[PDB]
Design a protein around this ligand. Structure first.
Ligand SMILES: CCCCCCCCCCCCCC(=O)OC[C@H](COP(=O)(O)OCC(O)COP(=O)(O)OC[C@@H](COC(=O)CCCCCCCCCCCCC)OC(=O)CCCCCCCCCCCCC)OC(=O)CCCCCCCCCCCCC
Ligand code: BCL
Ligand code: BCL
Ligand SMILES: CC[C@H]1c2cc3[nH]c4c(c3C)C(=O)[C@H](C(=O)OC)c4c3nc(cc4[nH]c(cc(n2)[C@@H]1C)c(C(C)=O)c4C)[C@@H](C)[C@@H]3CCC(=O)OC/C=C(\C)CCC[C@H](C)CCC[C@H](C)CCCC(C)C
Ligand SMILES: CC[C@H]1c2cc3[nH]c4c(c3C)C(=O)[C@H](C(=O)OC)c4c3nc(cc4[nH]c(cc(n2)[C@@H]1C)c(C(C)=O)c4C)[C@@H](C)[C@@H]3CCC(=O)OC/C=C(\C)CCC[C@H](C)CCC[C@H](C)CCCC(C)C
Ligand SMILES: *[C@H]1O[C@H](CO)[C@@H](O[C@@H]2O[C@@H](C)[C@H](O)[C@@H](O)[C@H]2O)[C@H](O)[C@@H]1O[C@H]1O[C@H](C(=O)O)[C@@H](O[C@H]2O[C@H](CO)[C@@H](O)[C@H](O)[C@H]2NC(C)=O)[C@H](OC(C)=O)[C@H]1OC(C)=O
Ligand SMILES: *[C@H]1O[C@H](CO)[C@@H](O[C@@H]2O[C@@H](C)[C@H](O)[C@@H](O)[C@H]2O)[C@H](O)[C@@H]1O[C@H]1O[C@H](C(=O)O)[C@@H](O[C@H]2O[C@H](CO)[C@@H](O)[C@H](O)[C@H]2NC(C)=O)[C@H](OC(C)=O)[C@H]1OC(C)=O
Ligand SMILES: CCCCCC/C=C\CCCCCCCC(=O)O[C@H](COC(=O)CCCCCCCCCCCCCCC)COP(=O)(O)OCCN
Ligand SMILES: COC(C)(C)C/C=C/C(C)=C/C=C/C(C=O)=C/C=C/C(C)=C/C=C/C=C(C)/C=C/C=C(\C)CC/C=C(C)/C=C/C=C(\C)C(=O)O
Ligand SMILES: COC(C)(C)C/C=C/C(C)=C/C=C/C(C=O)=C/C=C/C(C)=C/C=C/C=C(C)/C=C/C=C(\C)CC/C=C(C)/C=C/C=C(\C)C(=O)O
Ligand SMILES: COC(C)(C)C/C=C/C(C)=C/C=C/C(C)=C/C=C/C(C)=C/C=C\C=C(C)\C=C\C=C(C)\C=C\C=C(C)\C=C\CC(C)(C)OC
Ligand SMILES: [Fe+3]
Lengths: 39, 103, 62, 299, 71, 335, 273, 55, 39, 60
């Protein structure tokens, strides 16, 4: 496996990538909701 | 004769002149099924045998544009009723054909 | 004329006689190895009695 | 994605109809929502004023006008009397140009045809009956129109052919039945068409262990047979002779008139309009002395 | 919480993650595209009030049935 | 636990077999080669073929049969190469019309069909001879050509049963879905083939062939780690792989074959599938015309409660006619 | 009794449940815990089949017919005369077929064999379980199962086929049929080859793997080898049953029209729509 | 809890996440198939408008 | 081989991750309830 | 970010990416070509006002 330093460095990217992706998805849903809301 | 006689003084069923204690029912095998005796008995329940075919005395050809170039017998139901493509539909029949001196 | 007997029924019993004959043949073949059976009451063959154990001749090579 | 099933035969025989539940609900709602509602009807006295009425002789003047409103909405859209008439002169069978009003003279034949269906073929249509709406469904052209094409076309079973049987009613071969396997293929093609015309499968009319059996078949097979005899009369006596009446845009390539088939009424459903009963509301079209005990209000 | 990753090859984690998102995205799109309301390739230009809405009830005439009769 | 379902380590040999065992007349065609993909599942060598005189003629006769069928199919879509591929499974070369009986029919109305059938049949017989000669040249028993003769027997009944009922129209059309249309309509015409007892027997052996090959395939794979796939040596020099195979089935179902005799069970189940099949076809339309009614006569048919009951006037009304000729005119109805 | 080499192999061990308690033989048969459960379900299921025959219209072997319930009972147990007896027998049959597979695993373990045979039999159990459990459950009624009767189940097969107008057009059915036919061909070839090298003409030495590989090679153009033909036979026979289960589970739960009109997708590929 | 010693956490981590995923998808498709909760088509209906099974 | 110290460290994340999931799920349910009650 | 090319072989990711884009492009084009609104080979010369639209709610 990998040293603690590398698992931490990797976790920083995984958290940041996840949140960045979820932000872009949030805008996509904001646009979809503006066009044709589902509730 | 679809049910046994009932004693009016009690409502009790009489079988062969003598009472039965209980509600009588006529026994039958599963769903009243009975095995088939004979072919003659099975056929006696059906329609009469079909009449003979109508066959034409002699044959006249259709025009060539009415002749199918696919000879498979079920093609009208198995393919053509779903296939609507214009080229394929045109391929179904032979095209017109005429002696040159008649043009 | 025979009402009940017909050529499909005749042919079917001809097949059954052949097929039971075949099963007997195959069960004799099945008993070329491992038979007669060991038992507390001595050797046992079952039925039908097995065909004899078969010897195979190898080739002289080239 | 749920599947509805209807059992139509004995336990364990697998004589069952299956429907995709979503697909069926959209088809059914697509009938309900357009289904045309009837006028109420009323009962005056008095003698008939008509100048050129030849079929509807026997109904009151109010019932006649009520029938014309129905005919408009069922064939042409509501109040579209101009589809059939020179509206200045309803009695006319021709335009002011003298050219004939082909739709009106067809519609007079379609009244006689409808009365003939509802009257003489009650073994098929029973107390549901037919109206113009059954085929036309609000449009000038019904579905399932067919024309001459090839000799072996199976739709000629609904016109000038007769025999479809191929199975022997005995154990041994005989001269009574010399049917080809090709003829069994032809009946099979015909029977797929009838199954699709109703949206059913073969087990709706047969126990397929013996297609020739009537005892093992559901009673629908007997109704289906009367449907064949009805279509032959409809095609041979009413639809096909209209050949000189239509404009050539309606005729087939052989110049023949358009003919009907099972799908023309049924439109892929086990009964036309899923069994909507409309003929009872329109005595002009009964051809029958009473409809389900309701007596014909003749004059 | 990063100690979760010590068990895994990070290259394989990423390949596992991308494959999960690709499948999930395509499933959600094809579900919507198969709907009536969100069949956007045919009906995307409809305004929100004009777009289809599922029926709050069906209806019938009393003699009609969607299914044939039978036991 | 290793399942022995695919081979992780293949080995190549640079010289090769594929140069046959000593074989005399004819010629070995091509040079042997290895497929790595073939080597994953089975033995890797894809390699030389023997024909001789009978194999060459079989391919010539068979190629002509295939050409006649394909050219007629392609003609039937008006030579359209797109519709030829699009509609391929619905296309057929179709047997003659029924009214000819056994007489020669017109070329476009079954004449090409009988020609293709003739060249295919000759091609199949020449292939049987090719296999027979090859088995003897390799100094083998004749089990394989007699197994193949059982398949040829069933095939020939698609000629003899039409001959016996007296019409080439009854033959099987050459075509993917069209021959399945024939298969269904045959059962319809003759009143449900499920009640043909030789058809029932043929199914019993078809299913039994799957039962046996599943059992035998699994058994040999289950002992393959002990050399059980070296079946010839397990026959001549019984090892523990054979003993365990015998004991498994003995302990499971109370009786067992041998490593040799399981191949006889295999051989007879496969052969009897088509042999009983052919008998059932030959009996159909010649001895029995409605197999369901033969079932009623012989007590095969389970009773069900009646679904409808006819009155006597319905019994006369609901009889039809036997199907006749198609209308050879386009009637006007105007008067 | 025992085969002449058998006694050496009759050790304890390899059981899944019962340990030593049921670890014994009865004549040729191994018992074990799943032997006990097998005979329980076989006896109960058989005697209920005999009771079904007794209360039916005939003892004629071909005509006995124990039918499932009407569709109106849904997933409930019907009255026993009305199909509930079929439902009990179905539970016994599942119990028996499952017990038989697990007993085969105990036997394979005791002989040090691979588990191929139990799993190959699982292909047949899958097909049965599809016909009487999975497909009826997806259709929402146990009444969709086939009747237990030598010919009455053939009436069921016939009617289910024509519920889709032309069942030959079912694409998974075409594959399943192809596997069954290919399997029977492969079985005849493999049986013939082994017998032909072990029983050559009189006065000929016993053959060899080389000869059968040479013959097989000019039959198919490639040599499959000894392990390969057994892998293929297992693949074809079990694959037929798996594709059979697929072909019946798609008919009804997933497809409801006639099968010929399923092929409309092929006609509409855009290269030639 | 020593249940994390009787069971390997990685085995149980993937097993639970898998079980939760299967359960969530079963419940979504069940609701999506219902009349009352087929929310993609009818999600904008008010609670008084949404369908109800019969009394 | 887990130590009971590894267990105590892991169990803190597992319990709080479960709490986070339960919080989000119960908010999700209350939104669903406010839109379309099932009792 | 360029360090991912030490983690992954560029030669193999490029092939996978080109394959992914080709499949996705062909899928989307054929989905549109099969629609009514975007059957551009038959109806591409229609103005946007004239092109088909999927049926609206009846608003009743
Ligand atoms: C249409 C296509 C068909 C396609 C399908 C076709 C399937 C064909 C394969 C199945 C049949 C072969 C079965 C078999 O051979 O089992 C071994 C057994 C005995 O083996 P053995 O080695 O010869 O003898 C052992 C004995 O010496 C020492 O054993 P032990 O002391 O430990 O135990 C005592 C024995 C006592 O024997 C029995 O109890 C016999 C049990 C019934 C035998 C078969 C009767 C017929 C079929 C079943 C009808 C009752 C079924 C309900 O105990 C045992 O050995 C028990 C082990 C054998 C268990 C066999 C179970 C077979 C079940 C077959 C089911 C067939 C279903 C159709 O053999 C026999 O008992 C004699 C069998 C003779 C061949 C059968 C064909 C006869 C054709 C008619 C010829 C004229 C009359 C004989
Ligand atoms: C670069 C190191 C840090 C970072 C450092 C800062 C700093 C420092 C500031 C912000 C600010 C903001 N950040 Mg931040 N931020 C990061 C990651 C993110 C992520 C994410 C998905 O990871 C998101 C959604 C955001 C979002 C945001 C906004 C809420 C906010 C306003 C600016 C804006 O609209 O930016 C939109 C950007 C995005 C949606 C994505 C992020 C883009 C990249 C990572 C650059 C971020 C720096 C920001 C643009 C710098 C602004 C200029 C100022 C002179 C500092 N940041 C990274 C991890 N961010 C400002 C703030 O708090 O204002 C209220 C601010 O002063
Ligand atoms: C509605 C349809 C009917 C029906 C109608 C028929 C008909 C009709 C027949 C069968 C036949 C068979 N049916 Mg049935 N069948 C039905 C229901 C079933 C069911 C089922 C689960 O319902 C099953 C399992 C079966 C099973 C079977 C087989 C047991 C049997 C074929 C054996 C065989 O190996 O054939 C496959 C093997 C061959 C065809 C032999 C071929 C050998 C030749 C030599 C190969 C030549 C190849 C050549 C060189 C290459 C040519 C190239 C091309 C020209 C391009 N049927 C129902 C009742 N069935 C046959 C039979 O025997 O009936 C008694 C038969 O004729
Ligand atoms: C026991 C019953 C089962 C059975 C058995 C069986 N079949 C067999 C055998 C056996 C034991 C064989 O030995 C034999 C065989 O060869 O197997 C590989 C065969 C066979 N089973 C076949 C098919 C087959 N078997 C079937 C079924 C069955 N086979 C049963 C299930 C079916 C089904 C289910 O429908 C089919 C389709 C064949 C593969 C094969 C017989 C091959 C044969 O006779 O071919 C004749 C030749 C042709 C049709 C012509 C081919 C044309 C070329 C493509 C032309 C190429 C050009 C050429 C080179 C030009 C000429 C130039 C010259 C100068 C060279
Ligand atoms: C998967 C590929 C094929 C396959 C393989 C296969 N079958 C197998 C095996 C394998 C590998 C075994 O190891 C196993 C075995 O031990 O064989 C000797 C077996 C077996 N395959 C069998 C039969 C069989 N396989 C069939 C099919 C197939 N088997 C597939 C095509 C069929 C078909 C198609 O009809 C049958 C009849 C048995 C000989 C045997 C399993 C024996 C077993 O389970 O024994 C215990 C149970 C009993 C002895 C009787 C149970 C009685 C019930 C409790 C009551 C009756 C209920 C039943 C549903 C009634 C049905 C009435 C019918 C008329 C419909
Ligand atoms: C269409 O033509 C028919 C012709 O039958 C007209 O029907 C008339 O009225 C019926 C009640 C009556 O039963 C029928 O016998 C017949 O008398 C129908 O009204 C339509 O009329 C227009 O076309 C007529 C036509 O035949 O072309 C035309 O009539 C022409 O012939 C009559 C003699 O038969 C003559 O009186 C007309 O002057 C003559 N006209 C022309 C333009 O040729 C109608 O003419 C008149 C005046 O009525 C046409 O109608 C109109 C409004 O012009
Ligand atoms: C065209 O002719 C063919 C061949 O007769 C008719 O098809 C017949 O009927 C089908 C039941 C069957 O499938 C088919 O084999 C064949 O028998 C077809 O329907 C068309 O019929 C019209 O023309 C017939 C014709 O043969 O020319 C004609 O038949 C009658 O007249 C001819 C002389 O022209 C005479 O030879 C026939 O005996 C006679 N038959 C009958 C039954 O009257 C049809 O006339 C009638 C009344 O049927 C034509 O039918 C129509 C409606 O015009
Ligand atoms: C590898 C070899 C395997 C061999 C297996 C044999 C199995 C089955 C096939 C047998 C042949 C069947 C022929 C069927 C035709 C038939 O039956 O036609 C009969 C005449 O009778 C007859 O031809 C009588 C036919 C008798 C058949 C032979 C029986 C004697 C030998 C048995 C050998 C068994 C062991 C080997 C006519 O019938 P119908 O209905 O028209 O009559 C009434 C009309 N109103
Ligand atoms: C029937 O109902 C139906 C219709 C189906 C509806 C219901 C649907 C349901 C139930 C859906 C459920 C969805 C769900 C549930 O959990 C969904 C969960 C989704 C999740 C978890 C998404 C997570 C995304 C995470 C991403 C994208 C992370 C990216 C990471 C990146 C980019 C970092 C790469 C960095 C590297 C490599 C290092 C380089 C630097 C280096 C080398 C350096 O510096 O050296
Ligand atoms: C037909 O009926 C129908 C309609 C279907 C109805 C019926 C439905 C039914 C019966 C439902 C039953 C449901 C149920 C029953 O209990 C459901 C039970 C649900 C449960 C228990 C959910 C638990 C979720 C827990 C989660 C999500 C945990 C997340 C943890 C996280 C995020 C941190 C992980 C730890 C790490 C990362 C370690 C890092 C450090 C490390 C490694 C170190 O330091 O080393
Ligand atoms: C240019 O080359 C092209 C591109 C055209 C080549 C391509 C060709 C293609 C695409 C060919 C496709 C062929 C296909 C798809 C064929 C499908 C065949 C199938 C599925 C056949 C199935 C069954 C057929 C049977 C059982 C036929 C049996 C026929 C028999 C037994 C006929 C016997 C006939 C005899 C013995 C005739 C004797 C002649 C006499 C004169 C005695 O007449 C009776
Ligand atoms: Fe073997």
């Amino acid at each position: 496996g990998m040293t603690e330093e590398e698992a931490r460095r990797f976790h920083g990217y995984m958290v940041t990538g996840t949140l960045g992706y979820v932000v872009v998805a949030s805008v996509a849903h904001f646009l979809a909701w503006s066009w044709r809301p589902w509730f | 004769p679809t049910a046994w006689p009932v004693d009016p003084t009690t409502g009790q069923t009489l079988i062969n002149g003598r009472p039965v204690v209980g509600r009588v029912f006529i026994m039958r095998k599963t769903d009243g099924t009975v095995k088939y005796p004979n072919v003659a008995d099975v056929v006696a329940h059906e329609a009469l045998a079909p009449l003979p075919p109508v066959v034409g005395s002699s044959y006249q050809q259709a025009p060539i544009t009415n002749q199918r170039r696919m000879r498979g017998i079920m093609i009208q139901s198995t393919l053509w009723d779903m296939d609507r493509k214009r080229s394929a539909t045109r391929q179904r029949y032979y095209p017109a054909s005429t002696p040159a001196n008649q043009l | 004329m025979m009402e009940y007997i017909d050529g499909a029924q005749i042919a079917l019993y001809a097949f059954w006689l052949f097929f039971f004959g075949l099963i007997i043949y195959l069960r004799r073949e099945d008993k070329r190895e491992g038979y007669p059976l060991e038992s507390p009451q001595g050797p046992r063959d079952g039925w039908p009695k097995g065909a004899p154990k078969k010897t195979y001749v190898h080739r002289d090579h080239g | 994605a749920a599947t509805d099933t209807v059992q139509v035969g004995y336990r364990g025989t697998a004589m069952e109809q299956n429907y995709d539940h979503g697909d069926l609900k959209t088809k059914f709602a697509q009938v309900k929502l357009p289904q045309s509602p009837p006028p109420a009807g009323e009962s005056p006295p008095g003698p008939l004023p008509w100048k050129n009425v030849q079929v509807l002789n026997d109904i009151s003047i109010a019932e006649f006008n009520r029938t014309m409103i129905a005919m408009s909405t069922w064939v042409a859209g509501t109040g579209n009397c101009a589809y059939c008439h020179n509206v200045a002169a309803f009695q006319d069978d021709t335009l002011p140009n003298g050219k004939p009003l082909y739709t009106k003279i067809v519609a007079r034949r379609m009244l006689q045809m409808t009365r003939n269906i509802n009257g003489n073929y009650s073994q098929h249509v029973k107390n549901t009956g037919v109206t113009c709406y059954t085929c036309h469904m609000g449009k000038p052209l019904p579905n399932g129109l067919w024309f001459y094409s090839s000799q072996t076309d199976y739709l000629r079973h609904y016109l000038d052919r007769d025999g479809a049987r191929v199975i022997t009613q005995g154990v041994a071969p005989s001269n009574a039945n010399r049917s080809s396997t090709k003829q069994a293929e032809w009946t099979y093609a015909l029977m797929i068409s009838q199954s699709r015309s109703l949206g059913v499968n073969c087990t709706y009319c047969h126990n397929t262990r013996q297609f020739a059996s009537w005892r093992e078949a559901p009673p629908a097979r007997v109704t289906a047979y009367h449907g064949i005899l009805m279509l032959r009369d409809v095609n041979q006596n009413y639809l096909a002779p209209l050949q000189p009446v239509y404009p050539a845009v309606r005729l087939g390539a052989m110049g023949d008139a358009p003919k009907a088939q099972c799908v023309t009424c049924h439109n892929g459903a086990y009964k036309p309009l899923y069994g909507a009963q409309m003929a009872k509301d329109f005595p002009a079209m009964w051809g029958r002395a009473d409809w389900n005990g309701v007596p014909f209000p003749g004059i | 919480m990063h100690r979760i990753w010590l068990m895994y090859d990070p290259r394989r984690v990423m390949v596992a993650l991308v494959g999960f998102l690709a499948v999930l995205a395509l499933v959600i799109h094809f579900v919507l595209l198969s709907s009536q309301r969100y069949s956007w390739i045919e009906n995307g230009t409809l305004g929100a009030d004009q777009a289809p809405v599922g029926a709050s009830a069906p209806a019938a005439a009393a003699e009609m049935s969607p299914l044939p009769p039978g036991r | 636990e290793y399942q022995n379902l695919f081979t992780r380590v293949q080995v190549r040999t640079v010289p090769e077999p594929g140069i046959p065992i000593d074989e005399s007349t004819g010629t070995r065609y091509g040079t042997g080669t290895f497929s790595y993909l073939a080597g994953k599942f089975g033995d890797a060598q894809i390699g030389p073929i023997y024909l001789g005189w009978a194999g060459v003629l079989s391919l010539i006769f068979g190629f002509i049969a295939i050409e006649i069928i394909g050219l007629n199919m392609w003609a039937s879509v008006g030579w359209d190469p797109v519709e030829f591929i699009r509609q391929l499974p619905w296309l057929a070369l179709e047997p003659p019309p029924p009214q000819y009986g056994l007489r020669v029919p017109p070329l476009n109305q079954g004449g090409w069909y009988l020609m293709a059938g003739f060249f295919l049949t000759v091609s199949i017989i020449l292939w049987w001879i090719r296999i027979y000669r090859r088995a003897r040249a390799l100094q083998m028993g004749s089990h394989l050509p007699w197994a193949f003769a059982s398949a040829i027997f069933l095939y020939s009944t698609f000629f003899f049963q039409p001959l016996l009922v007296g019409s080439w129209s009854e033959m099987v059309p050459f075509g993917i879905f069209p021959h399945l249309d024939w298969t269904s309509a045959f059962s319809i015409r003759y009143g449900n083939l499920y009640y043909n007892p030789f058809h029932a027997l043929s199914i019993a052996f078809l299913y039994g062939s799957a039962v046996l090959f599943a059992m035998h395939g699994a058994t040999i794979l289950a002992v393959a780690r002990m050399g059980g796939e070296r079946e010839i040596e397990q026959i001549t020099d019984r090892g523990t792989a054979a003993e365990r195979s015998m004991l498994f089935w003995r302990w499971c179902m109370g009786f067992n074959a041998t490593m040799e005799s399981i191949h006889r069970w295999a051989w007879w189940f496969a052969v009897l599938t088509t042999f009983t099949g052919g008998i059932g076809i030959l009996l159909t339309g010649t001895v029995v015309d409605n197999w369901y009614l033969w079932g009623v006569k012989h007590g095969l048919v389970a009773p069900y409660p009646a679904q409808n009951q006819l009155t006597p006037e319905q019994q006369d009304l609901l009889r039809g006619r036997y199907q006749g000729t198609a209308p050879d005119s386009f009637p006007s109805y105007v008067v | 009794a025992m085969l002449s080499f058998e006694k050496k192999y009759r050790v304890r061990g390899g059981t899944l449940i019962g340990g030593d308690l049921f670890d014994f033989w009865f004549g040729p048969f191994y018992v074990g815990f799943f032997g006990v459960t097998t005979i329980f379900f076989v006896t109960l299921g058989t005697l209920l089949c005999v009771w079904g025959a007794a209360m039916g219209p005939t003892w004629n072997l071909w005509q006995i017919n124990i039918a499932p319930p009407d569709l109106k009972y849904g997933l409930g147990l019907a009255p026993l005369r009305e199909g509930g007896l079929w439902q009990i027998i179905t539970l016994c049959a599942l119990g028996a077929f499952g017990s038989w597979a697990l007993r085969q695993a105990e036997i394979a373990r005791k002989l040090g064999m691979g588990m191929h045979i139990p799993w190959a039999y699982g292909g047949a159990i899958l097909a049965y379980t599809t016909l009487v459990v999975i497909r009826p459950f997806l259709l929402g009624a146990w009444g969709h199962g086939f009747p237990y009767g030598i010919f009455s189940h053939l009436d069921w097969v016939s009617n289910v086929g024509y519920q889709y107008l032309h069942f030959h057009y079912n694409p998974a059915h075409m594959i399943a049929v192809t596997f069954f036919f290919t399997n029977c061909l492969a079985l005849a070839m493999h049986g013939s080859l082994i017998l032909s090298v072990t029983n050559p003409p009189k006065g000929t030495p016993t053959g060899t793997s080389e000869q059968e590989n040479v013959f097989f090679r000019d039959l198919l153009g490639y040599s499959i080898g000894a392990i390969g033909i057994h892998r293929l036979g297992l693949f074809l026979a079990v694959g037929a049953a798996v594709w059979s289960a697929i072909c019946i589970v798609i008919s009804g739960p997933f497809w409801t029209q006639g099968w010929p009109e399923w092929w409309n997708w092929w006609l509409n590929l855009p290269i030639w729509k």
